[PDB]
Amino acid sequence: GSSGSSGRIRKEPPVYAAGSLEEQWYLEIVDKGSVSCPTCQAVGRKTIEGLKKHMENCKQEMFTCHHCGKQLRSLAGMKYHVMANHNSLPSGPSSG
Numbered sequence: 001g002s003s004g005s006s007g008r009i010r011k012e013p014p015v016y017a018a019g020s021l022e023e024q025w026y027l028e029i030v031d032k033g034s035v036s037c038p039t040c041q042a043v044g045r046k047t048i049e050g051l052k053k054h055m056e057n058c059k060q061e062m063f064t065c066h067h068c069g070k071q072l073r074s075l076a077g078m079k080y081h082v083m084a085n086h087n088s089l090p091s092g093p094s095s096g
């Protein structure tokens with residue numbers, strides 16, 4: 001057996017903070033209807049909740065060579081494009 005009752009007002013702000021990203025993304029929705037990914041910025045979601053899960057893994061780090069300025073997802077592959085194309089073996093101030 002059991003019993004009980006309650007009833008009070010609810011005047012509190014949403015999970016969002018008074019100055020956080022969540023709020024920003026939220027607007028893009030309440031204004032447009034959907035929000036894009038701040039990481040890839042190619043695919044969005046109907047709301048944040050859904051996006052969060054997306055960025056939870058998508059959140060990756062991009063790189064960009066300096067010699068030429070190549071852009072590759074896999075750091076390894078890139079770091080190799082330099083030693084291959086920008087192969088400057090330390091020998092002398094000249095080649096010949």
Ligand SMILES: [Zn+2]
Pocket residue numbers: 037038039040041054055058059
């Ligand atoms: Zn993404």
Ligand SMILES: [Zn+2]
Pocket residue numbers: 065066067068069070081082086
């Ligand atoms: Zn390069």
